[PDB]
Symmetry: C3
Subunit: 114 residues, 3 copies
């Protein structure tokens, strides 16, 4: 899975160990070994949520499988809990787009997950 | 909801108020309360459009409702005028990807819209 | 075609000519007019891959056609090749998402393709 977080929160508020924690949490959550998990955090973004520049985040989770109505509902719970606790962002100022990638459409090591 | 602009134009030339203006124009355009609208602007990006480095833009629009062939045509006129006027970007140097999102695949406030 | 590269490699390591290089080679690989291909590179990113912070890349290739099982496979060799050769990233620490874009859902110059 690939998890990306874009936020207007300044880099300095991102705690030491945040990428480590997202990896471990997401691995336990999707059931995938952590080795396949990529994490990208982008701090200091311009962005606005209701024409308001209060702390917010726009995230996305891509995965070959493990995406679904029930599943995504659990992930919002997990992910929004972390941004709240770790970065102090209100959950209702957080959007997370979920993507169910087809294996043939993910290139990895000079080829794709055929 | 969810509008992103990646551009090589300098940060110093993105007008203050650009985010609010986008917020308002999109609210009108999509008939979605401005409150549901999130906007992200990324200036100073490396990027190139047709081999060339003159100002260019790569945007994407994600909305649960309101996406579709004819509508997208209007979104393009609206978005191209805005970038051309506010950022001095030429309309032929702009791509905008449109994404109709299923409510189950969008998380907000500890849950998803399904 | 639009190609984005997100990597933790320092900006100072992106060789001059990299964007032209990618433009040239993608045009050839996809056989599409180079004047139509945008390239976006983003260095110095907070990324983790398999829990590690060693060099890695999260890329994307959006294209109206020219995308499918086999081609994605060759795009990967070519792309992972370039990245390894210029940015010294190991191909097994590179993910590339392929998005077969639907014309009508891509905006450019005040309208949409098809």
């Amino acid at each position: 899975p690939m998890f990306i977080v874009n936020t207007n929160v300044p880099r300095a508020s991102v705690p030491d160990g945040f990428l480590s924690e997202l990896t471990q949490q997401l691995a336990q959550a999707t059931g995938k070994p952590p080795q396949y998990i990529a994490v990208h955090v982008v701090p200091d973004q311009l962005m606005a949520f209701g024409g308001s520049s209060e702390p917010c985040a726009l995230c996305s989770l891509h995965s070959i499988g493990k995406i679904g109505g029930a599943q995504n509902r659990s992930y919002s719970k997990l992910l929004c809990g972390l941004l709240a606790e770790r970065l102090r962002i209100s959950p209702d100022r957080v959007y997370i787009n979920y993507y169910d990638m087809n294996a043939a459409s993910v290139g990895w090591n000079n080829s794709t997950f055929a």
